[PDB]
Short mmCIF file of C-alpha atoms and ligand atoms in Angstrom, two decimals:
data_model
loop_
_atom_site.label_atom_id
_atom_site.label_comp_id
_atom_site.label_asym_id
_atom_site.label_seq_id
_atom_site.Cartn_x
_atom_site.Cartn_y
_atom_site.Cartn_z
CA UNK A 1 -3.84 -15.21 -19.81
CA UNK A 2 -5.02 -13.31 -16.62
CA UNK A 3 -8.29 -11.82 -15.08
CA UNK A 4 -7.42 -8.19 -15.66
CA UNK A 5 -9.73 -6.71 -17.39
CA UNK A 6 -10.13 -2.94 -19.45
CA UNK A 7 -6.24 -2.20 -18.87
CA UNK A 8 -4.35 0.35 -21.11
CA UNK A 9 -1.28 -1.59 -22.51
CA UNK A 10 1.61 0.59 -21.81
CA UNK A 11 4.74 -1.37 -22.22
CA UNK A 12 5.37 -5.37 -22.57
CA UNK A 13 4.46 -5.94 -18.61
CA UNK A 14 3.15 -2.49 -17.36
CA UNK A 15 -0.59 -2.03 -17.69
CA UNK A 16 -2.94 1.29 -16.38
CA UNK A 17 -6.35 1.25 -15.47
CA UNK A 18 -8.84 4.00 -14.04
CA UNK A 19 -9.77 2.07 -11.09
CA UNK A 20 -10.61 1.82 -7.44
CA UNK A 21 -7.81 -0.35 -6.25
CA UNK A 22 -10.20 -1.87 -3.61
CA UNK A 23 -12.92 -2.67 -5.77
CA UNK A 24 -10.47 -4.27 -8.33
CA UNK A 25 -8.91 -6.12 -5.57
CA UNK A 26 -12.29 -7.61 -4.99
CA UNK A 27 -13.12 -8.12 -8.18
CA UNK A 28 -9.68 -9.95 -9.34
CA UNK A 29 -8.58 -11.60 -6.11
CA UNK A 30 -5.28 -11.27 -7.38
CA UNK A 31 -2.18 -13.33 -5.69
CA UNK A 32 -0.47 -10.08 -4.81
CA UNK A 33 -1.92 -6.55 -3.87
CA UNK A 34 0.60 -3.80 -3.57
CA UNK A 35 0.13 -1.42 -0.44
CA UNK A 36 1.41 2.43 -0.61
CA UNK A 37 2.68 1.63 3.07
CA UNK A 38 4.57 3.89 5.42
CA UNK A 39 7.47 2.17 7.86
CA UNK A 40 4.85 1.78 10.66
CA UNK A 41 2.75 0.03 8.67
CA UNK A 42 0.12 2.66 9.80
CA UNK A 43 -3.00 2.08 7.65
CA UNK A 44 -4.31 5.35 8.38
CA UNK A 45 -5.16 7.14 5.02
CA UNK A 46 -4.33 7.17 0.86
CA UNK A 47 -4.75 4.06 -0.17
CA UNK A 48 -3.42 2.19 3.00
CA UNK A 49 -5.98 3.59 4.84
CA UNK A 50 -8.60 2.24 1.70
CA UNK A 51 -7.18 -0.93 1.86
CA UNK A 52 -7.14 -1.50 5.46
CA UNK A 53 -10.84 -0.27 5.88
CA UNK A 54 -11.97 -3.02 3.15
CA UNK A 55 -10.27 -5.72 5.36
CA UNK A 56 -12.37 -4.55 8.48
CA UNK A 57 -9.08 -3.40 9.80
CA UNK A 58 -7.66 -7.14 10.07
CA UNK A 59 -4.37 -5.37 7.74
CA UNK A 60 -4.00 -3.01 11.15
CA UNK A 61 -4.49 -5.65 13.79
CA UNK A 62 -1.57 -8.03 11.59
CA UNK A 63 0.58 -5.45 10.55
CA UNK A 64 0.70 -4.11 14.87
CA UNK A 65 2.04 -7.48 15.16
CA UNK A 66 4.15 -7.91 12.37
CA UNK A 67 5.95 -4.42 13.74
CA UNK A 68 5.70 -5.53 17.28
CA UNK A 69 7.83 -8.55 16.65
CA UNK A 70 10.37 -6.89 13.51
CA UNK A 71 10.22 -3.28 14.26
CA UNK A 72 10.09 -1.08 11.21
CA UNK A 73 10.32 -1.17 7.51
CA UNK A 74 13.02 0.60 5.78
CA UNK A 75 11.65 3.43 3.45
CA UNK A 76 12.39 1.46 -0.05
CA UNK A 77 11.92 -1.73 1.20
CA UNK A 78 8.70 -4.06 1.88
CA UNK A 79 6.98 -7.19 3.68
CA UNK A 80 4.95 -9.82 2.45
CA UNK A 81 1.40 -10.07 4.96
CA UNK A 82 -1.81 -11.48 3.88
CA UNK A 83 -4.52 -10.65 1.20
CA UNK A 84 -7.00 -10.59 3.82
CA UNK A 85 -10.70 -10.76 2.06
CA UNK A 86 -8.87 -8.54 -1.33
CA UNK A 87 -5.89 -10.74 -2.67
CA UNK A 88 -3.48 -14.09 -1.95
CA UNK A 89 -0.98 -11.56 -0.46
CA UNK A 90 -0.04 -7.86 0.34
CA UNK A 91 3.26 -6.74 -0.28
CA UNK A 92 3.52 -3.68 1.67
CA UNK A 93 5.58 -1.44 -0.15
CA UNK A 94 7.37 1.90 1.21
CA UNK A 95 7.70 4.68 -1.23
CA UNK A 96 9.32 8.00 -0.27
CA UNK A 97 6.99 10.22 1.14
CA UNK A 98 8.50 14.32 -0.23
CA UNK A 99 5.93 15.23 2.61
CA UNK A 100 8.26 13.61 5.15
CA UNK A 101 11.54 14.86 2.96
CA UNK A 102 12.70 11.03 1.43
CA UNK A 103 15.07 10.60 -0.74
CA UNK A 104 12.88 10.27 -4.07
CA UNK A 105 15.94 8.20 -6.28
CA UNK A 106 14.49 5.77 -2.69
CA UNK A 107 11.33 5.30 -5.39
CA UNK A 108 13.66 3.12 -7.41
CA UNK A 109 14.34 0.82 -4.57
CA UNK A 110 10.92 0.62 -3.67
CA UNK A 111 9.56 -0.44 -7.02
CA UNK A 112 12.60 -3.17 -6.91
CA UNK A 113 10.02 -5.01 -4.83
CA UNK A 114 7.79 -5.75 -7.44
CA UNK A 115 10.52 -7.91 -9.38
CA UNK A 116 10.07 -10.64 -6.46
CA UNK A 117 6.35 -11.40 -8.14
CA UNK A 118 5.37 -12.24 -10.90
CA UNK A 119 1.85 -10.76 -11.33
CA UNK A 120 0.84 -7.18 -8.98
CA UNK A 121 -2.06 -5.12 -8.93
CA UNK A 122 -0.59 -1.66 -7.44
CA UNK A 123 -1.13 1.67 -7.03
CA UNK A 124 1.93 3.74 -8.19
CA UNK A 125 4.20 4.60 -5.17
CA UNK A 126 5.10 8.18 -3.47
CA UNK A 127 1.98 9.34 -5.32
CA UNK A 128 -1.10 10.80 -4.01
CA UNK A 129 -0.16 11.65 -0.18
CA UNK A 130 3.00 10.75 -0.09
CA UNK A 131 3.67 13.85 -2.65
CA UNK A 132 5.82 12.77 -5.33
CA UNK A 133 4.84 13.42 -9.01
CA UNK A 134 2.74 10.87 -10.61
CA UNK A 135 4.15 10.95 -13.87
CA UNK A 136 7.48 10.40 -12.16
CA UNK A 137 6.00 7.26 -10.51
CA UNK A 138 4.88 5.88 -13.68
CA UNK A 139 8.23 6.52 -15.73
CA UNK A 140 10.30 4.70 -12.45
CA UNK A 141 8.01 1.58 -12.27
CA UNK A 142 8.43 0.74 -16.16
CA UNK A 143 12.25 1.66 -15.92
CA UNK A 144 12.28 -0.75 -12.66
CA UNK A 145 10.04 -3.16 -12.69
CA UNK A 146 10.34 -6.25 -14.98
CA UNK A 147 7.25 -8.30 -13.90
CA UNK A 148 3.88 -8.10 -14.78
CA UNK A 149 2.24 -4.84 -13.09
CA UNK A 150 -0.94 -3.53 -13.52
CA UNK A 151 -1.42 -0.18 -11.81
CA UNK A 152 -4.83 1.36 -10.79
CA UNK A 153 -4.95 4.94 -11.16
CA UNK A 154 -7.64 6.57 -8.52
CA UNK A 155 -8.43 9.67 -10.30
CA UNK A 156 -9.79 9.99 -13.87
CA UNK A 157 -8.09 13.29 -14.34
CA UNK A 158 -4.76 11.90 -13.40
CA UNK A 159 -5.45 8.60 -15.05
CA UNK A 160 -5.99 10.40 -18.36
CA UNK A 161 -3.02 12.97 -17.82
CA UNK A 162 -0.54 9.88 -17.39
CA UNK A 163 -2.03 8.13 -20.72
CA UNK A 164 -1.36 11.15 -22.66
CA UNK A 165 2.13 12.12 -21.70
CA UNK A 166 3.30 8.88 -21.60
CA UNK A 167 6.51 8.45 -23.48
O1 0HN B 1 -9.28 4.78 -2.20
C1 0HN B 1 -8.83 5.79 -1.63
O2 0HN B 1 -9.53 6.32 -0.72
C2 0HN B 1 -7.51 6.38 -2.11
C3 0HN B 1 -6.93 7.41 -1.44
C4 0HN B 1 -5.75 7.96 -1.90
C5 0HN B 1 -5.16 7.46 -3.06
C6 0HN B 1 -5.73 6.43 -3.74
C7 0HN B 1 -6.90 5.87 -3.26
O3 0HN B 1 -4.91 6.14 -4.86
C8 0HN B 1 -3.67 6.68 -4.54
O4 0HN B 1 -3.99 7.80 -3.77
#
């Protein structure tokens, strides 16, 4: 038994939610809160930029020196930093961004990350800003990832469009 509360069952370990991903974060203190990062690890805006601003910006002022001494991420690939004041942990994930022209079968990789824990609360990855197809999200992280993921969805629209054509 977890914490999560008023999720949409979609699969055996995938779970949806209307929710702000900040104010579940809060709510749940989860061990592990997924970040829609970019390879800078700049917080600036999406859900990053939501994120970072709930911390106070103490995500920025680590994640300068987590790139300081390790230099970049790899698009697909993540790092583990702290949960700040919202979670245990923050895996910072990279999603293609289509905005930036990624490789989208990259999304793939990127969800892979989620298989290192076994509980997340995420966002799905490459949508929103970083322009990839929600729906396409969602179908990649239950064909990926094997661990228990429950996603907040920011939008009610979207939230109820990716209920309904779920297959
Ligand atoms: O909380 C925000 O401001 C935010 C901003 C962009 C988002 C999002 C949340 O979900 C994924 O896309």
């Amino acid at each position: 038994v977890n914490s999560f509360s008023g999720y949409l069952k979609l699969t055996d370990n995938v779970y949806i939610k209307n929710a702000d991903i900040v104010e579940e974060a809060k709510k749940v203190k989860p061990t592990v809160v997924v970040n829609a990062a970019n390879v800078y690890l700049k917080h600036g805006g999406g859900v990053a930029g939501a994120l970072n601003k709930a911390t106070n910006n103490a995500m920025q002022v680590e994640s300068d020196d987590y790139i300081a001494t390790n230099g970049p991420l790899k698009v697909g690939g993540s790092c583990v930093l702290s949960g700040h004041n919202l979670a245990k942990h923050c895996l910072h994930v990279v999603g293609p961004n289509v905005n930036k022209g990624e490789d989208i079968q990259l999304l793939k990789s990127a969800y892979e990350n989620f298989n290192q824990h076994e509980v997340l609360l995420a966002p799905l990855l490459s949508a929103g800003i970083f322009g990839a197809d929600p729906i396409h999200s969602l179908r990649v992280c239950v064909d990926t990832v094997r661990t228990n993921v429950y996603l907040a969805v920011f939008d009610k629209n979207l939230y109820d469009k990716l209920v309904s054509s779920f297959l």
